[PDB]
Curated annotation (Swiss-Prot), chain B:
<dbReference type="GO" id="GO:0042802">
    <property type="term" value="F:identical protein binding"/>
</dbReference>
<dbReference type="GO" id="GO:0003924">
    <property type="term" value="F:GTPase activity"/>
</dbReference>
<keyword id="KW-0378">Hydrolase</keyword>
<dbReference type="InterPro" id="IPR006674">
    <property type="entry name" value="HD_domain"/>
</dbReference>
<keyword id="KW-0460">Magnesium</keyword>
<comment type="function">
    <text>dGTPase preferentially hydrolyzes dGTP over the other canonical NTPs.</text>
</comment>
<dbReference type="GO" id="GO:0050897">
    <property type="term" value="F:cobalt ion binding"/>
</dbReference>
<dbReference type="GO" id="GO:0003697">
    <property type="term" value="F:single-stranded DNA binding"/>
</dbReference>
<dbReference type="GO" id="GO:0030145">
    <property type="term" value="F:manganese ion binding"/>
</dbReference>
<protein>
    <recommendedName>
        <fullName>Deoxyguanosinetriphosphate triphosphohydrolase</fullName>
        <ecNumber>3.1.5.1</ecNumber>
    </recommendedName>
</protein>
<dbReference type="GO" id="GO:0000287">
    <property type="term" value="F:magnesium ion binding"/>
</dbReference>
<dbReference type="GO" id="GO:0008832">
    <property type="term" value="F:dGTPase activity"/>
</dbReference>
<dbReference type="GO" id="GO:0015949">
    <property type="term" value="P:nucleobase-containing small molecule interconversion"/>
</dbReference>
<comment type="subunit">
    <text>Homotetramer.</text>
</comment>
<dbReference type="InterPro" id="IPR003607">
    <property type="entry name" value="HD/PDEase_dom"/>
</dbReference>
<dbReference type="InterPro" id="IPR020779">
    <property type="entry name" value="dNTPase_1"/>
</dbReference>
<feature type="domain" description="HD">
    <location>
        <begin position="62"/>
        <end position="269"/>
    </location>
</feature>
Amino acid sequence: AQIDFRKKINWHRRYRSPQGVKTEHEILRIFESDRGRIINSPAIRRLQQKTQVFPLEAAVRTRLTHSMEVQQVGRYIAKEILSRLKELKLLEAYGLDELTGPFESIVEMSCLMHDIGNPPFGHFGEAAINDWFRQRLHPEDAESQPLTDDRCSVAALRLRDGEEPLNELRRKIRQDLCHFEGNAQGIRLVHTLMRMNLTWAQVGGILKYTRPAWWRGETPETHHYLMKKPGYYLSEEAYIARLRKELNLALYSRFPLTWIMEAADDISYCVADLEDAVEKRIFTVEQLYHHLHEAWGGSLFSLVVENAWEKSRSRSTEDQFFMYLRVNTLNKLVPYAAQRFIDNLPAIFAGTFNHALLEDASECSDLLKLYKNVAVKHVFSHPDVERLELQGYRVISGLLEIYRPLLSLSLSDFTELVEKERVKRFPIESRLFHKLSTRHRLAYVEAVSKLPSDSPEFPLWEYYYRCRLLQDYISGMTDLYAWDEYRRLMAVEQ
Amino acid sequence: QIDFRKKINWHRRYRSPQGVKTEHEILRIFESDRGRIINSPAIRRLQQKTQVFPLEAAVRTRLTHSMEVQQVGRYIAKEILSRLKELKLLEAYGLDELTGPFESIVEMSCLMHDIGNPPFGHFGEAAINDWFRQRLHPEDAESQPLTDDRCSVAALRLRDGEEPLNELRRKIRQDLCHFEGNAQGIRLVHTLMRMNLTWAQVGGILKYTRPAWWRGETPETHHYLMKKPGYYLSEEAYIARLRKELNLALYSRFPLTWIMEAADDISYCVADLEDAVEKRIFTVEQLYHHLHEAWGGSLFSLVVENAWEKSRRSTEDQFFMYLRVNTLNKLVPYAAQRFIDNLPAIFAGTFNHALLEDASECSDLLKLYKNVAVKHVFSHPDVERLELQGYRVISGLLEIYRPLLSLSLSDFTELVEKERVKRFPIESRLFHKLSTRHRLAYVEAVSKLPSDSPEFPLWEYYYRCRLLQDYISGMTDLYAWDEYRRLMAVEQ
Ligand code: NI
Ligand code: NI
């Protein structure tokens, strides 16, 4: 092989693509166009009110501010990597000499969008959606040979005896629909839903996992880490294939700048969650310092944490302590992350590298695990947080049940509903339908129209795309919007 | 005579970097600035102060707006630097090793451009000033001591024969009635949050150069830079040191500011229109017609009509994508060109115009967006009601804390020192409710004073009022509203 980043940092687009030879400048302007597209997308503002950890009530992080923090850390790691590469006289050799700006920016924006796909109430929205679609589709009963009391409630998707091609499609659909995941939904959102038409490189930095959502069974040994969670849905399959071709990815391989983004997320996530914890008066700073000292056991802790504490004891103490905790943490981990990226650059470039930059038995990872431990033991277990998670789960389950009658309809009927807009014998599901976002309905019409109308696959694909539509609509909501819809449609408030 | 090494100053007020530095070490310093800002509570507090509409999610907040402005500022900065490189002027102006810093300072100046604003924005302003006017009446201190001086504070009332003390009284009364977002921003970044930014960075926040205590007309040659107050009587010393570190003449301004300002103008106009359509006030076609009518190969044809033609994904999104893109592709180059064309004056910090404020077609496009906005959006009864409400809320909080300002020096001082005073239950608890940061700022400032001087009661009262304004202006919309409701015993 060889490391030529010109072959990875691909400034083409899916639609209306830039063509031909380009100035270093023209390339830069393209990736800046990407920045504009993202910073101005509704998806991002929607982040400015999805909950991070605490109920919104102002100084507490939201998905947005967290994403901005991650962006900053990503920038710092990218800059350290590029700078070390310049000191190693390796920048030209790796084809990065005219792509430093793009490199940096792709990382920054990949960070900003790392949460773009998450549904309201985060991992509990996820939980709610998957659990609901599991109770309706039971993918576990499609694992092997057709079960004679197949628990799935959808006639079309139930495994029928003798028709193994159709049965395989049924299998994939049922598994896929029960594996909604923030990142996969993120790819879907950026491409099919918002139609942002980013550069291939930029979309690549969003693809954080490489397992198909419809995946059943164990993951390959050699790819365990990159396939921890679903990375793309059955729908984006074609798209993801083209993406692989444009970014020179082997199957289940990942874009490199992703590894960078990931590391940034880990760092920011840990430290910030602790600071917010102190801000919500859960524990004082001293209490935090003791929990850390105890949960640990010239070492790293001494440097980062104990020096942060000593600085803190000689502006406001909470702010001083956390300023220097952040600073010291970053000054230890960011160089390490950079060093790991470079040391492992062949594998990371290939996109096959089966570890995180930080996931280790290295002291650095242990520091991160320390923050995460204190967080999960003394913050995420707090009754107000837990209550909010419970509530969110009820709200999303509730909405899904409210729109159930859209998924109850036969192909004939639902299609009639799409075409006539307002159906006389179907008042409720007509109005339920109108309540779906035009963006999402459009995506449905678009996807269904591209189908072989007479093929036996059609009812299956249609049902899939219809469920896909409903999940699009729900996952697209902010916490407050989802909660509010739930309350109004339950006729609890006007 | 343009040496940007003399403006892009990487020193700090406290614990400053000293000596010779690598281009890299300089970069790392300005990145440290970025970190300090992006992680400051002030910025998240922006993620819920209202921009135009009530929070209810797709609508802009002070934060998202600030991010949009940041992007436009970055683009303008890059265009300026790039045009300077094409003119072979980059080395000559001392920017060849400061391109990263240049860009970054602009970006962050943008992100912080709203950091100072009080809850409910210009109506919080209104409320604060109007309240302190009813209490201090600066208009009665304009000239010679008035014998029925309407001011209700014994110490600050103009007394006959004592013209030095009278001048101090004059400045204090005028200053306290001229609370302004930007001045409060300087105060916030420096005295309150103690962020200790670089001088250059603080400089990009200083948008106006008129002292808050200014009375009478502004100089002819500086009319534009002194439209609004830029710094309070307290930050006076600080601002002086800032002038020395950034090589500013009196009432002169930092350059990168002009850039930030232009970014604000652009993204503010376009965005407000988009959000207007999102809140279903008018459709896209309705908007296009309001624009076409309110106008009159020209610019409109290019930017707006081409946006509309492209528009005919979702139509609202397509139209606004290309409206934003075309607008930027016209105005950002122009802004850059204006910055460079006028670089001597802008560098000096004396340039008496905005990059965009003109009779130039570009400014007219902006004025067009602003006109359609102010006529068909800001006049919408729901916006107006929110402004009215906000003014009531801030006026209400100020009245609620009034008894802290009613106390004598002796008594209020006793309150500060003993923390809980037995004969003063209410004002004790009111006092405890003030943020420790703000109270600390008060103690800090008062302790530095000549304890026996006749100026002391005056300065103390000033700093006390300063304290209360710090606390109120520091709130988010929702927090201020909520405090007003709870302290009125309307909700538990
Ligand atoms: Ni995250
Ligand atoms: Ni603004």
